[PDB]
């Protein structure tokens, strides 16, 4: 009937969003393990740099300088974002 | 000159990752868009609410307010721990 169809439509539309809210509210493991990757990688470029210096290998050194910029930029955006998803990007990807 | 090989190798390896670094940077722009979107979506729901009353349409009102609840949860629920 018309009220029946409308409510069922309302139910289907809203509950589709339900799986997303459950994953966002959920207590999750790796907060900063994704951050830890960056930290680990950061330590790696530092040693790579020292390695490049000791052998006077400029291509290695230049690459790591650029790589150091990249990880630092990424690592500054990770630390900058603040405990909220902030986008509906979760819904789709 | 093989340092040239080194530079070209160094160039190719790092710059390949460049688009990735740009998408990480772009994630801030899209939060600022999403906050404008939420305000936009919010205003839409109040009008839907007003519209629903005038047309005696409860399902419309229920659907949009509940959807608003969820979207608010998704976009601003402080993640635990």
UniProtKB/Swiss-Prot annotation, chain A:
GO terms for cellular component: membrane; plasma membrane. One of its GO terms (molecular function) is protein homodimerization activity. Its main location: membrane. It is a multi-pass membrane protein. GO terms for biological process: D-glucose transmembrane transport. The chain crosses the membrane at residues 5-25, 33-53, 57-77. Residues 2-59 form the PQ-loop domain. It comes from the Bacteria. Keywords: Cell membrane, Membrane, Sugar transport, Transmembrane, Transmembrane helix, Transport. It is found in: Cell membrane. Disulfide bonds: none annotated. The homodimer mediates transmembrane sugar transport down a concentration gradient. Transport is probably effected by rocking-type movements, where a cargo-binding cavity opens first on one and then on the other side of the membrane. Homodimer. NCBIfam families: SemiSWEET_2 (NF037968). This is Sugar transporter SemiSWEET. It comes from Leptospira biflexa serovar Patoc (strain Patoc 1 / ATCC 23582 / Paris). The lineage of its organism: Bacteria, Pseudomonadati, Spirochaetota, Spirochaetia, Leptospirales.
Curated annotation (Swiss-Prot), chain B:
It comes from the Bacteria. Gene3D superfamilies: 1.20.1280.290. The homodimer mediates transmembrane sugar transport down a concentration gradient. Transport is probably effected by rocking-type movements, where a cargo-binding cavity opens first on one and then on the other side of the membrane. Keywords: Cell membrane, Membrane, Sugar transport, Transmembrane, Transmembrane helix, Transport. It is found in: Cell membrane. This is Sugar transporter SemiSWEET. One of its GO terms (biological process) is D-glucose transmembrane transport. It comes from Leptospira biflexa serovar Patoc (strain Patoc 1 / ATCC 23582 / Paris).
